[PDB]
């Protein structure tokens, strides 16, 4: 499974809170059949388990802060292994969010062939979150934004240098955004 995974198409999806990551990923799953792994969903699944670990994660995520790298990466890796036998490709949604998170993923799992940069303005994100969990109040949204611009924007730079970033314009209507997404995936 390790080797299957290292040989799979691996797509990173990066974007600010409320930018449209999950929305576009669900469209990618429906059309292309990738195995969707949301870091948020995996973390919230742990919270919902009622485990002691979940309670810890709850406290972190409700404050809008980043969970320890090893915790989220281990979750994803295990999730990839469990799906490795049946998976046609992996869609990694909301990881990496730090340059170090990308590096450790490449060390422990494999190399991305594509990064979809789901690009939107902060203002757009804020109103999208507002119009739509426990991380939803004003203060938390701001911390989430802060962290994104501080920690996660360097990830885009990293993979632009790698040469695998395709920017999609998330200010467009969802289907027009997806048309950009499709163009990038069809090219793989
Ligand atoms: N790697 C990691 N390392 C450490 N900690 C981590 C971590 N990953 C997660 N965590 C922790 O978990 C927390 C949650 O993170 P996480 O769940 O991973 O990311 P998020 O950005 O907070 O997720 P969102 O669902 O809020 O945003 P989204 O981009 O998916 O937008 P969506 O498609 O739903 O859309 C939002 C709204 O906008 C609408 N919408 C989407 N696109 C459009 C469009 N084009 N036009 C109009 N409306 C649109 C949608 O219908 C919807 O209503 C993190 O803060 C962190 O604490």
How does this model look, in words?
ATP binds at residues 18-23, 132, 172. By secondary structure, this protein is an alpha/beta fold. The protein has a single domain (1-188), classed as P-loop containing nucleotide triphosphate hydrolases (Rossmann fold, 3-Layer(aba) Sandwich), CATH 3.40.50. Helix content is 59%, strand content 13%. A five-stranded parallel β-sheet has the order 2-3-1-4-5, sandwiched between helices. The protein is globular.
Task: Please give the count of helices.
Answer: 9
Which molecules are bound in this entry? BIS(adenosine)-5'-pentaphosphate
User: DSSP strand (E) fraction?
Assistant: 5-15%
Question: What is the tally of beta strands?
Answer: 5
Element order: H for helix, E for strand: HEHEHHHEHEHHEH
Q: What does the overall shape look like?
A: globular
Count of all domains: 1
Biggest β-sheet: strands ordered side by side in the sheet: 2-3-1-4-5
The biggest sheet, with number of strands, parallel, antiparallel or mixed sense and barrel status, is:
5 strands, parallel
Q: End-to-end span in angstroms?
A: 22 Å
CATH H level, superfamily name = P-loop containing nucleotide triphosphate hydrolases
* CATH architecture group name: 3-Layer(aba) Sandwich
Rounded radius of gyration (Å): 16 Å
- Sheet/helix structural class: alpha/beta
Helix content: 55-70%
What is the CATH topology assignment? Answer: Rossmann fold
For the record, the CATH class is Alpha Beta
């Amino acid at each position: 499974m390790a080797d299957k995974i290292k040989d799979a198409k691996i797509i990173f999806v990066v974007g600010g809170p409320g930018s449209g990551k999950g929305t576009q990923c669900e469209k990618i799953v429906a059309k292309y059949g990738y195995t969707h792994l949301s870091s948020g969903d995996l973390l919230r699944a742990e919270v919902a388990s009622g485990s002691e670990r979940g309670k810890q994660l709850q406290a972190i995520m409700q404050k809008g802060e980043l969970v320890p790298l090893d915790t989220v990466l281990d979750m994803i890796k295990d999730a990839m292994i469990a799906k490795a036998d049946v998976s046609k490709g992996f869609l990694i949604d909301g990881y990496p969010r730090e340059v170090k998170q990308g590096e450790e993923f490449e060390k422990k799992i494999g190399k991305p062939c594509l990064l979809l940069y789901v690009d939107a303005k902060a203002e757009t994100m804020v109103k999208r979150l507002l119009k739509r969990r426990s991380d939803d109040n004003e203060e938390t949204i701001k911390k989430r934004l802060d962290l994104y611009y501080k920690a996660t924007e360097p990830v885009i730079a990293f993979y632009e240098g790698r040469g695998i970033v395709k920017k999609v314009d998330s200010e467009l209507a969802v289907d027009d955004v997806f048309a950009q997404v499709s163009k990038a995936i069809d090219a793989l």
